Amino acid sequence: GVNPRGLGPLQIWQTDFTLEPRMAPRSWLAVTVDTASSAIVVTQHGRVTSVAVQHHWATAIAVLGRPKAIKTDNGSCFTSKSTREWLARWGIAHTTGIPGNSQGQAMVERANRLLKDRIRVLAEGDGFMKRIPTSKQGELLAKAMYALNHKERGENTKTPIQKHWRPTVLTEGPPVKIRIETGEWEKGWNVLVWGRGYAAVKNRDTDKVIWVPSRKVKPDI
Amino acid sequence: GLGPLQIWQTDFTLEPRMAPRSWLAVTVDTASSAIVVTQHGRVTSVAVQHHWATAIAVLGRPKAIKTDNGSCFTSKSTREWLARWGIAHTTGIPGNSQGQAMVERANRLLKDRIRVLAEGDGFMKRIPTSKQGELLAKAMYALNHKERGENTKTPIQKHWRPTVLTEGPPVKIRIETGEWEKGWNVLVWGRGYAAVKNRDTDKVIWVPSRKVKPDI
């Protein structure tokens, strides 16, 4: 249940590498998403390396501030003594899951899709149904980052950038009931975040926070 | 002229420590004092365009930008570029205090940071190319996320005015009398119910979503 999802900005980040053929020859995009505000940072790289990753996070930090922890996968660029020491110097905790849709890399997985679609739209919009000219990649990538952060993601009233600097973080949370394994509804929990997919619930007696499927929680009354 | 994203000052500045791409494009928001920098091989039109695209992805779209009268700012591409971005562009004589003094000071602050970081990492001369990108980002992080000295607010604080909201927007709830009473704020929505907190009694109750509405 300790899913990598922060309750507020700068608590938990998810970083990843995604290939975008449209941006070749340097088609590697390093992507990071603040699991709480959902804002994202992307940089272009010609190769998946520890050096690239370090350069990438330094950029994200410059943009979003210093996070408390970053979740990634077992990739060598993340587990290298070099990066491990880099994180340590920045005082940023690190956790590695596994390359996939495993609880700990899903949010950044979706961020890749979003980023990729935005790119395809700006690419075809400029007539580049194929590879984007090398000299127009930077700007186009920035245009994408801009759109994704400085413009609500539809269902949301507020934009990511809005959620990042001026977040809403409840101090207590209304009481709820969660459907325990037995399929029975249990009292004693309060919800702090209730998304379409997942809800964050804290235990009233242990102050433990866990994320559960939104349909396993209902108002307590 | 308080107000972020109102007026920006942009210029180039030479920094040998960043060679080959030793030409740094510099922009500073005249209200928040936030600074964005990108390195380039040569001062051109596409360069400023790349820089502004970047600076925008970082700080947002500006209303107007000021520069000197160098070719890269007064060319055809650049003017059309800004027009497409819908950004007002003014020029002036290089150094003109009117609208170049602040970015000029920005130049020096940037360079000082670069020196300190570079030397601090054992680079007394040209900083290795592979490490330039990160150092540049580290500089921006310091210049924008840390206080200068006099000012008690950091550029990021002036630019984004961060704060932590502890409740949703003000709402009104239909009571048993059919009336819509104000004084409540939405905490969380779910399962067709809205959890509202009274901003007077701090009382928190669950109320059917249908009996909830905004309150200006």
- Tokens found for residue A76: 């060598």
Main-chain phi, psi angles of B64, to 5 degrees: -145, 150
Main-chain phi, psi angles of A158, to 5 degrees: -95, 150
Q: Helices (H), strands (E): how many in chain B?
A: 6, 10
CB burial of A131-140 (b: ≥16 within 10 Å; e: otherwise) equals ebeeebbbbb
* One domain, residues B93 and B149: yes
User: Which residue of A62, A165, A214 is in closest CB contact with B160?
Assistant: A165
CB-CB neighbors (< 8 A) of A62 in chain B: 137-138, 140-141, 144-145
Kindly report the number of other CB atoms within 10 A of residue B89's CB atom: 18
* One domain, residues B144 and B47: yes
**H helix runs in chain B, sequence order:** 45-59, 71-74, 76-85, 97-120, 129-145, 155-160
Closest Cα partner for B109 from B9, B4, B13? B13
* One domain, residues B107 and B172: no
Main-chain phi, psi angles of B118, to 5 degrees: -55, -60
Return the sign of the alpha-carbon dihedral for residues B4, B8, B12, B13.
negative
- Give me the domain span that covers residue B210: 163-216
H-helix or E-strand containing A153? none
- Tokens found for residue B84: 């497409």
Query: Nearest 5 degrees, angle CA A97-CA A103-CA A109?
Result: 90
3-state SS class at B134: helix
Residue with tokens 């899951």: A97
Check if the beta carbon of residue B48 is closer than 8 Å to that of residue B9: no
**H helix runs in chain A, sequence order:** 50-64, 76-79, 81-90, 106-125, 137-149, 160-165
* One domain, residues A21 and A7: yes
Return the sign of the alpha-carbon dihedral for residues A150, A154, A160, A165.
positive
Q: Which residue of B has its CA nearest to A54?
A: B134
Closest Cα partner for B36 from B76, B16, B65, B79? B65
Cross-chain Cβ contact A149/B57 below 8 Å: yes
CA distance A218 to A204: 16
* One domain, residues B145 and B184: no
Which of B130, B147, B162 corresponds to the end of one domain? B162
* One domain, residues A96 and A198: no
> Given CB atoms, is A171 within the 8 Å cutoff of chain B?
yes
CB-CB neighbors (< 8 A) of A65 in chain B: 145, 156
Q: How many beta-carbon pairs below 8 A join chains A and B?
A: 108
**What is the Cα B34 distance to its own chain's centre?**
6
* One domain, residues B96 and B187: no
Q: Distances in Å between the alpha carbon of A147 and those of A187, B15, B53, B118?
A: 42, 32, 12, 33
CA distance A34 to A13: 5
In chain A, the largest separation of any two C-alpha atoms, in whole Å, equals 60
Kindly report the number of other CB atoms within 10 A of residue A165's CB atom: 20
* One domain, residues A43 and A68: yes
How near does any CA of chain A get to the CA of B29, in Å?
Answer: 15
User: Structure solved using which method?
Assistant: X-ray
User: Which amino acid, one-letter code, is at A65?
Assistant: G
Check if the beta carbon of residue A60 is closer than 8 Å to that of residue A183: no
* One domain, residues A17 and A68: yes
For residue A217, count CB atoms less than 10 angstroms from its CB and return exposed for 0-12, middle for 13-18, buried for 19 or more: buried
Mutate to test the interface with B, among A170, A179, A190, A220 (most CBs of B within 10 A): A170
Cross-chain Cβ contact B189/A193 below 8 Å: no
CA distance A89 to A83: 10
Which of A 113-142 lie inside 8 A of B, CB atoms?
A: 135, 138-139, 142
CATH number of the domain encompassing residue A52:
3.30.420.10
Main-chain phi, psi angles of A200, to 5 degrees: -100, 125
Kindly provide the resolution of this structure in angstroms, with one decimal: 2.5
Kindly give, in sequence order, each residue whose CB lies less than 8 Å from that of residue A41, ignoring residues fewer than 6 positions away.
A31, A32, A56, A59, A60, A63, A64, A145
- Tokens found for residue B195: 């959890």
> Given CB atoms, is B61 within the 8 Å cutoff of chain A?
yes
User: Which residue of A62, A150, A170 is in closest CB contact with B166?
Assistant: A170
Mutate to test the interface with B, among A32, A87, A194 (most CBs of B within 10 A): A194
> Given CB atoms, is A1 within the 8 Å cutoff of chain B?
no
CATH number of the domain encompassing residue B192:
2.30.30.10
CA distance B115 to B125: 9
- Tokens found for residue B193: 């119910």
Query: Nearest 5 degrees, angle CA A187-CA A193-CA A196?
Result: 100
User: Which residue of A59, A135, A143 is in closest CB contact with B137?
Assistant: A59
Cis peptide before B20 (omega within 30 of 0): yes
* One domain, residues A133 and A214: no
Cis peptide before A25 (omega within 30 of 0): yes
C-alpha distance across the termini of chain B, in Å: 29
Question: A69-72 and A93-96: which strand pairing?
Answer: parallel
How near does any CA of chain A get to the CA of B99, in Å?
Answer: 25
Q: Distances in Å between the alpha carbon of A114 and those of A27, B26, B121?
A: 16, 30, 37
* One domain, residues A28 and A76: yes
CA distance A3 to A201: 12
User: Which residue of A8, A150, A194 is in closest CB contact with B190?
Assistant: A194
CA distance B37 to B52: 9
Check if the beta carbon of residue B72 is closer than 8 Å to that of residue B47: yes
Q: Distances in Å between the alpha carbon of B166 and those of A5, A171, A200, B118?
A: 18, 6, 16, 41
Closest Cα partner for A208 from A9, A7, A69, A66? A7
Check if the beta carbon of residue B180 is closer than 8 Å to that of residue B173: yes
Q: Distances in Å between the alpha carbon of B152 and those of A84, A97, A190, B148, B165?
A: 34, 41, 37, 8, 22
Count: domains in chain B: 2
Kindly report the number of other CB atoms within 10 A of residue B181's CB atom: 12
Cross-chain Cβ contact A219/B168 below 8 Å: no
Cross-chain Cβ contact B57/A142 below 8 Å: yes
Cross-chain Cβ contact B141/A62 below 8 Å: yes
CB-CB neighbors (< 8 A) of A163 in chain B: none
Question: B64-66 and A93-96: which strand pairing?
Answer: unpaired
**What is the Cα B59 distance to its own chain's centre?**
3
* One domain, residues B175 and B89: no
CB-CB neighbors (< 8 A) of B204 in chain A: 172, 174
Check if the beta carbon of residue A29 is closer than 8 Å to that of residue A46: no
CB-CB neighbors (< 8 A) of A63 in chain B: 58
CB-CB neighbors (< 8 A) of A190 in chain B: none
